[PDB]
């Protein structure tokens, strides 16, 4: 196939990249923990870069070329992973900054130092 | 006084759509709720889907009533399946 959408979800622990197909069918997936980083290095943007590199290699192994990349989750490695999708042979056209915004919804778990 | 704006679902033929508007106007005439003005926006593309639909027909019915058959309109439009929306706004 040629077109898919790259769902990156980079949160304070993990930066999970799944390259899926446009009506949502995952071609290949690789995370920051799949690359081997087990510790807090999962949060570092080097692991997000590496995870995007491996997902990009698997996506070119199945053959898709023009992505449409959706950044989700509050973390740190979003920019390096978008940059690493570019430098690994793919095109990043649109950038969907879609973190899940509740309007008011459920109440969060308690603040931490209390 | 009320502005009664509702969305008829699109997959409906034109004489049947006239029968829908005649139905809910017959419901409003159960009061004496005079119909002081009508307007059809027509097929508008909804900003988000309602039941399954991207689009729907709009009907604006201006009413001068005694606030009862408006509530009969509310219950009959929450039940009739050939309607996507309704609001009744107190025109003040």
């Amino acid at each position: 196939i040629e077109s898919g959408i790259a769902h990156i979800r980079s949160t304070f622990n993990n930066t999970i990249v799944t390259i899926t197909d446009t009506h949502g069918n995952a071609i290949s997936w690789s995370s920051a923990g799949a690359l081997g980083f087990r510790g807090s290095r999962k949060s570092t943007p080097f692991a997000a870069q590496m995870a995007a590199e491996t997902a990009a290699k698997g996506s070119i192994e199945h053959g898709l070329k023009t992505l449409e990349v959706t950044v989700k989750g509050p973390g740190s490695g979003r920019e390096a992973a978008i940059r690493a999708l570019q430098a690994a042979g793919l095109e990043v056209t649109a950038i969907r900054d879609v973190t899940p915004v509740p309007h008011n919804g459920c109440r969060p778990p308690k603040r931490r130092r209390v | 006084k009320y502005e009664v704006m509702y969305i008829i679902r699109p997959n409906i033929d034109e004489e049947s759509k006239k029968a829908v508007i005649e139905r809910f106007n017959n419901v409003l005439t159960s009061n004496g709720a005079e119909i002081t003005g009508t307007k059809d926006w027509g097929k508008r593309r909804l900003a988000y889907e309602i039941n399954d639909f991207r689009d729907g027909f709009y009907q604006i019915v201006n009413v001068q009533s005694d606030a009862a058959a408006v509530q009969e309109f509310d219950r009959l439009a929450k039940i009739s399946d050939d309607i996507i929306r309704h609001i009744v706004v107190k025109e003040e």
């Binding site: - | 969305i7 508008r44 909804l46 900003a47 309602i50 729907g56 929306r85 609001i87 706004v89």
Partner: protein, 64 residues
């Protein structure tokens, strides 16, 4: 800035005016605050009431 509704003298905003509400609403769908559009307090109140009613009839979006 300058208020819209004081300039054009227009009163109750009439939810049917979807293009005017679409001017005040931001790109994603949010209501722009008063320090961006420059309106009054009162006119921002009638604007937000208008936008919420027009959202519930899908004349305006929620999320984009």
């Amino acid at each position: 800035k300058v208020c819209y509704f004081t300039s054009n003298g227009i009163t109750h905003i009439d939810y049917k005016d979807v293009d005017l509400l679409k001017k005040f609403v931001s790109e994603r769908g949010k209501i722009l605050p008063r320090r961006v559009t420059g309106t009054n307090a009162k006119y921002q109140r009638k604007l937000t009431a208008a936008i919420k009613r027009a959202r519930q009839m899908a004349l305006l979006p929620y999320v984009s």
